[PDB]
Amino acid sequence: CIFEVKHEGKVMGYACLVGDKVMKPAHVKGTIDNADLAKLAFKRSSKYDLECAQIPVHMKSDASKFTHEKPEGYYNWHHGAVQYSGGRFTIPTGAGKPGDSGRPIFDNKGRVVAIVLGGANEGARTALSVVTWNKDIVTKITPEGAEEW
Amino acid sequence: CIFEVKHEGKVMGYACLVGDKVMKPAHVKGTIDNADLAKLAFKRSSKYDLECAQIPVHMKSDASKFTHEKPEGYYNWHHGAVQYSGGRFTIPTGAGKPGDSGRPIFDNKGRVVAIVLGGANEGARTALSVVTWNKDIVTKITPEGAEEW
Amino acid sequence: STNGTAHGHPHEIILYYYELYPTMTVVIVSVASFVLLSMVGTAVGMCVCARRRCITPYELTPGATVPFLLSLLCCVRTTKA
Amino acid sequence: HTTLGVQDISTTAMSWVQKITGGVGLIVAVAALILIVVLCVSFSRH
Amino acid sequence: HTTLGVQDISTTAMSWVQKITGGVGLIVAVAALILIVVLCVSFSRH
To answer: For this UniProt entry, which segments traverse the membrane (chains D, E)?
Structure first.
Protein backbone atom coordinates (compact mmCIF):
# COMPACT_ATOMS: atom_id res chain seq x y z
CA CYS A 1 0.00 0.00 0.00
CA ILE A 2 2.91 2.36 0.67
CA PHE A 3 5.04 3.34 -2.30
CA GLU A 4 7.91 5.80 -2.40
CA VAL A 5 8.20 8.97 -4.40
CA LYS A 6 11.75 9.31 -5.78
CA HIS A 7 13.37 12.45 -7.15
CA GLU A 8 16.74 12.30 -8.88
CA GLY A 9 17.09 8.87 -7.37
CA LYS A 10 16.21 10.21 -3.88
CA VAL A 11 13.19 9.40 -1.69
CA MET A 12 11.22 12.61 -1.11
CA GLY A 13 7.95 11.37 0.38
CA TYR A 14 5.50 8.53 -0.04
CA ALA A 15 2.40 7.49 -1.91
CA CYS A 16 -0.39 5.47 -0.47
CA LEU A 17 -3.16 3.23 -1.79
CA VAL A 18 -6.16 4.30 0.35
CA GLY A 19 -9.75 3.38 -0.49
CA ASP A 20 -9.88 3.16 -4.25
CA LYS A 21 -7.59 6.11 -5.01
CA VAL A 22 -3.77 6.37 -5.01
CA MET A 23 -2.61 9.26 -2.84
CA LYS A 24 0.60 11.28 -2.50
CA PRO A 25 1.10 14.78 -1.12
CA ALA A 26 1.06 17.42 -3.85
CA HIS A 27 4.12 19.17 -2.44
CA VAL A 28 6.28 16.02 -2.84
CA LYS A 29 8.70 16.22 -5.80
CA GLY A 30 9.42 13.11 -7.82
CA THR A 31 7.46 10.28 -9.35
CA ILE A 32 6.15 7.15 -7.67
CA ASP A 33 8.76 4.42 -7.88
CA ASN A 34 6.37 1.93 -9.45
CA ALA A 35 5.68 1.56 -13.16
CA ASP A 36 1.95 0.95 -12.84
CA LEU A 37 1.53 3.87 -10.45
CA ALA A 38 3.88 6.32 -12.19
CA LYS A 39 2.03 6.30 -15.52
CA LEU A 40 -1.28 7.32 -13.95
CA ALA A 41 -3.08 10.65 -14.34
CA PHE A 42 -3.30 12.49 -11.02
CA LYS A 43 -5.78 15.26 -10.12
CA ARG A 44 -4.10 17.93 -8.04
CA SER A 45 -5.99 19.76 -5.22
CA SER A 46 -4.02 22.67 -3.71
CA LYS A 47 -6.51 23.23 -0.89
CA TYR A 48 -5.80 19.76 0.48
CA ASP A 49 -2.21 19.69 -0.74
CA LEU A 50 -3.40 16.29 -1.97
CA GLU A 51 -2.92 14.68 -5.38
CA CYS A 52 -5.03 11.58 -6.00
CA ALA A 53 -5.59 9.14 -8.88
CA GLN A 54 -7.40 5.81 -9.20
CA ILE A 55 -5.92 2.41 -8.29
CA PRO A 56 -5.40 0.06 -11.27
CA VAL A 57 -7.65 -3.03 -10.97
CA HIS A 58 -4.62 -5.32 -10.45
CA MET A 59 -3.55 -3.40 -7.32
CA LYS A 60 -6.99 -2.60 -5.85
CA SER A 61 -6.60 -5.66 -3.62
CA ASP A 62 -3.56 -3.83 -2.24
CA ALA A 63 -5.34 -0.73 -0.99
CA SER A 64 -5.82 0.08 2.68
CA LYS A 65 -9.28 1.10 3.96
CA PHE A 66 -8.71 4.40 6.52
CA THR A 67 -12.10 5.26 8.99
CA HIS A 68 -13.52 8.39 10.55
CA GLU A 69 -13.48 6.58 13.88
CA LYS A 70 -10.67 7.86 15.99
CA PRO A 71 -11.11 7.93 19.78
CA GLU A 72 -8.55 9.64 21.96
CA GLY A 73 -5.68 7.24 22.56
CA TYR A 74 -2.62 5.89 20.77
CA TYR A 75 -2.28 5.19 17.07
CA ASN A 76 0.39 3.39 15.06
CA TRP A 77 2.81 4.79 12.49
CA HIS A 78 6.17 3.69 11.09
CA HIS A 79 8.23 5.50 13.60
CA GLY A 80 6.31 4.47 16.63
CA ALA A 81 3.08 5.41 18.30
CA VAL A 82 1.19 8.57 17.55
CA GLN A 83 -1.06 10.08 20.24
CA TYR A 84 -4.51 11.44 19.52
CA SER A 85 -6.34 13.82 21.83
CA GLY A 86 -8.03 17.21 21.71
CA GLY A 87 -8.52 16.68 18.02
CA ARG A 88 -4.78 16.60 17.46
CA PHE A 89 -2.23 13.92 16.56
CA THR A 90 1.20 14.37 18.13
CA ILE A 91 4.53 12.59 18.48
CA PRO A 92 7.80 12.97 20.36
CA THR A 93 9.63 15.78 18.61
CA GLY A 94 12.36 14.36 16.45
CA ALA A 95 10.53 11.18 15.49
CA GLY A 96 9.19 12.65 12.25
CA LYS A 97 11.33 14.39 9.64
CA PRO A 98 11.07 15.82 6.13
CA GLY A 99 10.42 12.93 3.80
CA ASP A 100 7.79 11.27 6.00
CA SER A 101 4.79 12.82 4.18
CA GLY A 102 2.40 10.28 2.75
CA ARG A 103 2.98 7.84 5.61
CA PRO A 104 -0.35 6.61 7.06
CA ILE A 105 -1.29 6.55 10.72
CA PHE A 106 -3.00 3.22 11.33
CA ASP A 107 -5.04 2.17 14.28
CA ASN A 108 -4.79 -1.25 15.92
CA LYS A 109 -7.05 -2.95 13.39
CA GLY A 110 -5.12 -1.63 10.42
CA ARG A 111 -7.58 1.02 9.35
CA VAL A 112 -5.70 4.08 8.05
CA VAL A 113 -6.85 6.97 10.27
CA ALA A 114 -4.94 9.95 8.77
CA ILE A 115 -2.06 10.64 6.37
CA VAL A 116 0.88 12.80 7.53
CA LEU A 117 1.66 15.96 5.56
CA GLY A 118 4.01 17.73 7.95
CA GLY A 119 4.31 18.80 11.55
CA ALA A 120 4.52 21.89 13.72
CA ASN A 121 7.12 21.81 16.48
CA GLU A 122 5.67 22.90 19.77
CA GLY A 123 8.44 21.74 22.11
CA ALA A 124 8.50 18.31 23.67
CA ARG A 125 5.96 17.15 21.09
CA THR A 126 5.08 17.99 17.49
CA ALA A 127 1.42 18.40 16.43
CA LEU A 128 1.04 16.63 13.12
CA SER A 129 -0.56 18.21 10.08
CA VAL A 130 -2.70 15.42 8.60
CA VAL A 131 -5.33 14.53 6.00
CA THR A 132 -8.23 12.86 7.89
CA TRP A 133 -11.66 11.55 7.10
CA ASN A 134 -14.71 13.27 8.49
CA LYS A 135 -18.25 11.81 8.57
CA ASP A 136 -17.57 10.62 5.06
CA ILE A 137 -15.47 13.34 3.48
CA VAL A 138 -11.75 14.04 3.53
CA THR A 139 -10.36 16.89 5.64
CA LYS A 140 -7.03 18.45 6.51
CA ILE A 141 -5.85 19.45 9.95
CA THR A 142 -2.85 21.77 10.01
CA PRO A 143 -1.53 22.92 13.41
CA GLU A 144 -0.30 26.50 13.65
CA GLY A 145 3.29 26.77 12.37
CA ALA A 146 3.50 23.42 10.59
CA GLU A 147 6.66 22.51 8.67
CA GLU A 148 5.61 20.57 5.60
CA TRP A 149 7.57 17.32 5.55
CA CYS B 1 -32.89 -24.26 -3.93
CA ILE B 2 -29.97 -24.19 -6.38
CA PHE B 3 -30.66 -25.46 -9.89
CA GLU B 4 -28.33 -25.47 -12.86
CA VAL B 5 -28.75 -23.72 -16.17
CA LYS B 6 -27.57 -26.01 -18.99
CA HIS B 7 -26.75 -25.00 -22.55
CA GLU B 8 -26.08 -27.61 -25.21
CA GLY B 9 -25.72 -30.05 -22.37
CA LYS B 10 -23.24 -27.75 -20.57
CA VAL B 11 -23.62 -25.96 -17.21
CA MET B 12 -23.44 -22.21 -17.81
CA GLY B 13 -24.62 -20.74 -14.51
CA TYR B 14 -27.21 -21.40 -11.84
CA ALA B 15 -30.75 -20.62 -10.84
CA CYS B 16 -31.91 -20.04 -7.33
CA LEU B 17 -35.18 -20.25 -5.43
CA VAL B 18 -35.05 -17.09 -3.25
CA GLY B 19 -38.09 -15.69 -1.44
CA ASP B 20 -41.05 -16.59 -3.58
CA LYS B 21 -39.41 -16.01 -6.97
CA VAL B 22 -37.07 -18.22 -9.03
CA MET B 23 -33.93 -16.33 -10.00
CA LYS B 24 -31.18 -16.78 -12.60
CA PRO B 25 -28.85 -14.20 -14.11
CA ALA B 26 -30.17 -12.80 -17.38
CA HIS B 27 -26.79 -13.13 -19.08
CA VAL B 28 -26.70 -16.92 -18.50
CA LYS B 29 -27.44 -18.95 -21.66
CA GLY B 30 -29.41 -22.16 -21.41
CA THR B 31 -32.54 -23.35 -19.68
CA ILE B 32 -32.95 -24.49 -16.09
CA ASP B 33 -32.33 -28.22 -15.87
CA ASN B 34 -35.64 -28.90 -14.15
CA ALA B 35 -38.95 -29.55 -15.90
CA ASP B 36 -41.10 -27.57 -13.47
CA LEU B 37 -38.72 -24.62 -13.54
CA ALA B 38 -37.93 -24.65 -17.27
CA LYS B 39 -41.54 -24.23 -18.42
CA LEU B 40 -42.03 -21.04 -16.41
CA ALA B 41 -42.45 -17.50 -17.77
CA PHE B 42 -39.56 -15.27 -16.70
CA LYS B 43 -39.57 -11.45 -16.58
CA ARG B 44 -36.24 -10.07 -17.73
CA SER B 45 -34.73 -6.91 -16.15
CA SER B 46 -31.58 -5.65 -17.94
CA LYS B 47 -30.79 -3.06 -15.28
CA TYR B 48 -30.32 -5.79 -12.68
CA ASP B 49 -29.13 -8.37 -15.18
CA LEU B 50 -31.73 -10.41 -13.31
CA GLU B 51 -34.47 -12.66 -14.70
CA CYS B 52 -37.07 -13.77 -12.17
CA ALA B 53 -40.27 -15.85 -12.21
CA GLN B 54 -42.54 -17.26 -9.50
CA ILE B 55 -41.94 -20.53 -7.62
CA PRO B 56 -44.54 -23.25 -8.31
CA VAL B 57 -46.55 -24.06 -5.14
CA HIS B 58 -45.01 -27.57 -4.94
CA MET B 59 -41.47 -26.14 -4.68
CA LYS B 60 -42.18 -23.05 -2.54
CA SER B 61 -41.15 -25.09 0.51
CA ASP B 62 -37.78 -25.35 -1.25
CA ALA B 63 -37.02 -21.64 -1.45
CA SER B 64 -34.31 -19.94 0.58
CA LYS B 65 -35.12 -16.72 2.48
CA PHE B 66 -31.91 -14.06 1.80
CA THR B 67 -31.83 -10.74 4.50
CA HIS B 68 -30.61 -7.18 4.29
CA GLU B 69 -28.60 -7.83 7.44
CA LYS B 70 -24.97 -8.19 6.58
CA PRO B 71 -22.37 -7.04 9.13
CA GLU B 72 -18.72 -6.91 8.18
CA GLY B 73 -17.24 -10.38 8.57
CA TYR B 74 -17.16 -13.71 6.76
CA TYR B 75 -19.93 -15.25 4.71
CA ASN B 76 -20.37 -18.71 3.21
CA TRP B 77 -20.46 -19.76 -0.44
CA HIS B 78 -19.83 -23.00 -2.32
CA HIS B 79 -16.20 -22.41 -2.86
CA GLY B 80 -15.36 -21.30 0.60
CA ALA B 81 -15.76 -18.20 2.68
CA VAL B 82 -16.54 -14.82 1.24
CA GLN B 83 -15.43 -11.69 3.12
CA TYR B 84 -17.64 -8.66 3.57
CA SER B 85 -16.31 -5.23 4.48
CA GLY B 86 -16.43 -1.67 3.19
CA GLY B 87 -19.65 -2.55 1.46
CA ARG B 88 -17.87 -5.09 -0.69
CA PHE B 89 -17.79 -8.90 -0.91
CA THR B 90 -14.44 -10.39 -1.91
CA ILE B 91 -12.70 -13.74 -2.27
CA PRO B 92 -9.24 -15.12 -2.95
CA THR B 93 -8.66 -14.55 -6.65
CA GLY B 94 -9.07 -17.81 -8.49
CA ALA B 95 -11.79 -19.23 -6.26
CA GLY B 96 -14.60 -17.99 -8.50
CA LYS B 97 -14.79 -18.61 -12.24
CA PRO B 98 -17.17 -18.15 -15.17
CA GLY B 99 -20.13 -20.40 -14.55
CA ASP B 100 -20.52 -19.49 -10.87
CA SER B 101 -23.23 -16.84 -11.45
CA GLY B 102 -26.45 -17.53 -9.61
CA ARG B 103 -24.66 -19.09 -6.66
CA PRO B 104 -25.90 -17.58 -3.35
CA ILE B 105 -23.73 -16.24 -0.57
CA PHE B 106 -25.23 -17.51 2.68
CA ASP B 107 -24.54 -16.36 6.16
CA ASN B 108 -24.13 -18.71 9.12
CA LYS B 109 -27.87 -19.09 9.69
CA GLY B 110 -28.57 -19.97 6.09
CA ARG B 111 -30.08 -16.69 5.04
CA VAL B 112 -29.07 -15.87 1.45
CA VAL B 113 -27.25 -12.52 1.67
CA ALA B 114 -26.39 -11.83 -2.03
CA ILE B 115 -26.28 -13.66 -5.36
CA VAL B 116 -23.04 -13.66 -7.40
CA LEU B 117 -23.16 -12.23 -10.92
CA GLY B 118 -19.46 -11.87 -11.68
CA GLY B 119 -16.27 -10.49 -10.24
CA ALA B 120 -13.63 -7.85 -10.85
CA ASN B 121 -10.03 -8.95 -10.37
CA GLU B 122 -8.12 -6.51 -8.25
CA GLY B 123 -5.04 -8.61 -7.47
CA ALA B 124 -4.81 -10.86 -4.46
CA ARG B 125 -8.60 -10.68 -4.11
CA THR B 126 -11.58 -10.28 -6.42
CA ALA B 127 -14.44 -7.89 -5.51
CA LEU B 128 -17.66 -9.70 -6.31
CA SER B 129 -20.44 -8.17 -8.36
CA VAL B 130 -23.62 -9.21 -6.55
CA VAL B 131 -27.40 -8.77 -6.32
CA THR B 132 -28.18 -7.78 -2.70
CA TRP B 133 -31.19 -6.76 -0.69
CA ASN B 134 -31.47 -3.25 0.66
CA LYS B 135 -33.93 -2.08 3.35
CA ASP B 136 -36.51 -4.16 1.54
CA ILE B 137 -35.66 -3.81 -2.13
CA VAL B 138 -33.21 -5.63 -4.37
CA THR B 139 -29.98 -3.92 -5.47
CA LYS B 140 -26.91 -4.68 -7.52
CA ILE B 141 -23.33 -3.93 -6.57
CA THR B 142 -20.84 -4.09 -9.43
CA PRO B 143 -17.18 -3.33 -8.65
CA GLU B 144 -15.23 -1.39 -11.28
CA GLY B 145 -13.99 -3.73 -14.02
CA ALA B 146 -16.16 -6.75 -13.21
CA GLU B 147 -15.98 -9.84 -15.43
CA GLU B 148 -19.46 -11.28 -15.65
CA TRP B 149 -19.26 -14.95 -14.69
CA SER C 1 -30.83 60.09 -50.53
CA THR C 2 -32.09 57.98 -47.41
CA ASN C 3 -35.37 57.45 -45.30
CA GLY C 4 -34.11 54.37 -43.58
CA THR C 5 -33.36 54.50 -39.87
CA ALA C 6 -30.03 53.70 -38.21
CA HIS C 7 -29.34 50.04 -37.41
CA GLY C 8 -31.00 47.08 -35.71
CA HIS C 9 -29.36 45.11 -34.67
CA PRO C 10 -25.68 45.05 -35.74
CA HIS C 11 -26.34 45.13 -39.50
CA GLU C 12 -26.26 48.91 -39.97
CA ILE C 13 -23.58 48.89 -37.28
CA ILE C 14 -21.20 47.58 -39.93
CA LEU C 15 -22.57 50.06 -42.47
CA TYR C 16 -21.07 52.94 -40.49
CA TYR C 17 -17.62 51.50 -41.25
CA TYR C 18 -18.04 53.38 -44.53
CA GLU C 19 -18.34 56.69 -42.67
CA LEU C 20 -16.13 58.36 -40.05
CA TYR C 21 -12.64 57.19 -40.99
CA PRO C 22 -10.48 54.12 -41.76
CA THR C 23 -9.74 52.81 -38.26
CA MET C 24 -12.86 51.53 -36.49
CA THR C 25 -14.12 47.99 -37.05
CA VAL C 26 -10.76 46.26 -36.62
CA VAL C 27 -10.26 47.83 -33.19
CA ILE C 28 -13.77 46.79 -32.20
CA VAL C 29 -12.99 43.25 -33.35
CA SER C 30 -9.84 43.26 -31.24
CA VAL C 31 -11.89 44.41 -28.26
CA ALA C 32 -14.35 41.59 -28.91
CA SER C 33 -11.47 39.12 -29.01
CA PHE C 34 -10.23 40.46 -25.69
CA VAL C 35 -13.72 40.04 -24.26
CA LEU C 36 -13.79 36.45 -25.52
CA LEU C 37 -10.43 35.84 -23.86
CA SER C 38 -11.81 37.21 -20.60
CA MET C 39 -14.82 34.92 -20.98
CA VAL C 40 -12.55 31.97 -21.70
CA GLY C 41 -10.25 32.80 -18.78
CA THR C 42 -13.27 32.99 -16.47
CA ALA C 43 -14.46 29.57 -17.62
CA VAL C 44 -11.00 28.07 -17.13
CA GLY C 45 -10.86 29.59 -13.65
CA MET C 46 -14.35 28.28 -12.92
CA CYS C 47 -13.36 24.74 -13.89
CA VAL C 48 -10.30 24.95 -11.65
CA CYS C 49 -12.53 26.24 -8.86
CA ALA C 50 -14.91 23.35 -9.47
CA ARG C 51 -11.95 21.04 -8.95
CA ARG C 52 -11.08 22.95 -5.79
CA ARG C 53 -14.58 22.16 -4.53
CA CYS C 54 -14.52 18.47 -5.45
CA ILE C 55 -11.06 18.26 -3.89
CA THR C 56 -11.31 17.11 -0.28
CA PRO C 57 -14.04 14.65 -1.30
CA TYR C 58 -11.52 13.30 -3.82
CA GLU C 59 -9.92 10.73 -1.52
CA LEU C 60 -12.49 8.02 -0.84
CA THR C 61 -15.37 6.86 1.36
CA PRO C 62 -19.11 7.58 1.12
CA GLY C 63 -20.09 11.25 1.01
CA ALA C 64 -21.21 12.15 -2.50
CA THR C 65 -22.25 11.32 -4.93
CA VAL C 66 -24.54 12.88 -2.32
CA PRO C 67 -23.98 16.61 -2.90
CA PHE C 68 -22.96 15.48 -6.39
CA LEU C 69 -26.38 16.44 -7.74
CA LEU C 70 -27.48 18.91 -7.14
CA SER C 71 -23.85 19.16 -8.25
CA LEU C 72 -22.17 21.41 -10.83
CA LEU C 73 -22.00 18.97 -13.74
CA CYS C 74 -19.23 17.10 -11.93
CA CYS C 75 -19.53 16.72 -9.20
CA VAL C 76 -21.11 14.06 -11.42
CA ARG C 77 -21.10 12.36 -13.61
CA THR C 78 -18.26 11.24 -11.35
CA THR C 79 -19.59 9.46 -8.26
CA LYS C 80 -19.49 5.87 -9.50
CA ALA C 81 -19.09 3.17 -9.98
CA HIS D 1 -19.66 66.86 -34.52
CA THR D 2 -18.03 67.31 -31.09
CA THR D 3 -15.37 65.00 -29.14
CA LEU D 4 -13.13 62.10 -30.08
CA GLY D 5 -13.50 58.35 -30.13
CA VAL D 6 -16.10 57.93 -32.79
CA GLN D 7 -19.36 57.67 -30.86
CA ASP D 8 -22.05 55.68 -32.88
CA ILE D 9 -24.75 53.10 -31.29
CA SER D 10 -28.42 53.04 -29.76
CA THR D 11 -30.70 54.13 -26.77
CA THR D 12 -32.94 51.15 -26.01
CA ALA D 13 -31.10 48.64 -28.21
CA MET D 14 -27.86 50.04 -26.81
CA SER D 15 -29.09 49.39 -23.27
CA TRP D 16 -30.14 45.86 -24.20
CA VAL D 17 -26.54 44.88 -24.91
CA GLN D 18 -24.95 46.99 -22.17
CA LYS D 19 -27.15 45.38 -19.52
CA ILE D 20 -25.69 41.98 -20.38
CA THR D 21 -22.07 43.00 -19.79
CA GLY D 22 -20.61 43.80 -16.58
CA GLY D 23 -22.81 40.78 -16.04
CA VAL D 24 -21.10 37.49 -16.49
CA GLY D 25 -17.45 38.09 -15.61
CA LEU D 26 -18.49 39.64 -12.30
CA ILE D 27 -20.77 36.67 -11.67
CA VAL D 28 -18.04 34.07 -12.14
CA ALA D 29 -15.66 36.15 -10.02
CA VAL D 30 -18.20 36.23 -7.18
CA ALA D 31 -18.90 32.52 -7.58
CA ALA D 32 -15.17 31.82 -7.48
CA LEU D 33 -14.85 33.73 -4.21
CA ILE D 34 -17.88 31.95 -2.75
CA LEU D 35 -16.36 28.59 -3.65
CA ILE D 36 -13.16 29.61 -1.88
CA VAL D 37 -15.19 30.64 1.17
CA VAL D 38 -16.93 27.26 1.30
CA LEU D 39 -13.57 25.53 0.85
CA CYS D 40 -12.27 27.41 3.89
CA VAL D 41 -15.36 26.30 5.81
CA SER D 42 -14.47 22.70 5.00
CA PHE D 43 -10.87 23.34 6.03
CA SER D 44 -12.15 24.74 9.33
CA ARG D 45 -14.51 21.79 9.70
CA HIS D 46 -11.57 19.39 9.48
CA HIS E 1 -51.76 31.31 -56.40
CA THR E 2 -48.29 31.81 -54.87
CA THR E 3 -45.65 29.12 -53.44
CA LEU E 4 -45.28 25.37 -53.60
CA GLY E 5 -46.48 22.48 -51.50
CA VAL E 6 -50.19 22.70 -52.05
CA GLN E 7 -51.44 24.67 -49.06
CA ASP E 8 -55.18 23.84 -48.28
CA ILE E 9 -56.79 23.54 -44.56
CA SER E 10 -58.55 25.76 -41.78
CA THR E 11 -58.09 28.63 -39.16
CA THR E 12 -59.98 27.54 -36.05
CA ALA E 13 -60.61 23.95 -37.16
CA MET E 14 -57.00 23.85 -38.33
CA SER E 15 -55.84 24.93 -34.87
CA TRP E 16 -58.04 22.31 -33.22
CA VAL E 17 -56.07 19.50 -34.84
CA GLN E 18 -52.66 21.18 -34.66
CA LYS E 19 -53.01 21.73 -30.92
CA ILE E 20 -53.28 17.97 -30.42
CA THR E 21 -50.00 17.14 -32.14
CA GLY E 22 -46.70 17.96 -30.88
CA GLY E 23 -48.72 16.75 -27.93
CA VAL E 24 -48.52 13.07 -27.30
CA GLY E 25 -45.12 11.97 -28.61
CA LEU E 26 -43.44 14.69 -26.55
CA ILE E 27 -45.44 13.58 -23.52
CA VAL E 28 -44.34 9.95 -23.72
CA ALA E 29 -40.75 11.05 -24.33
CA VAL E 30 -40.81 13.19 -21.19
CA ALA E 31 -42.48 10.39 -19.22
CA ALA E 32 -39.83 7.97 -20.45
CA LEU E 33 -37.07 10.29 -19.22
CA ILE E 34 -38.82 10.76 -15.88
CA LEU E 35 -39.07 6.99 -15.44
CA ILE E 36 -35.35 6.71 -16.13
CA VAL E 37 -34.68 9.44 -13.56
CA VAL E 38 -36.69 7.58 -10.91
CA LEU E 39 -34.91 4.35 -11.83
CA CYS E 40 -31.58 6.08 -11.20
CA VAL E 41 -32.92 7.27 -7.84
CA SER E 42 -33.65 3.65 -6.94
CA PHE E 43 -30.18 2.65 -8.13
CA SER E 44 -28.71 5.36 -5.91
CA ARG E 45 -30.94 4.24 -3.04
CA HIS E 46 -29.47 0.74 -3.26
So the answer is: 23-43
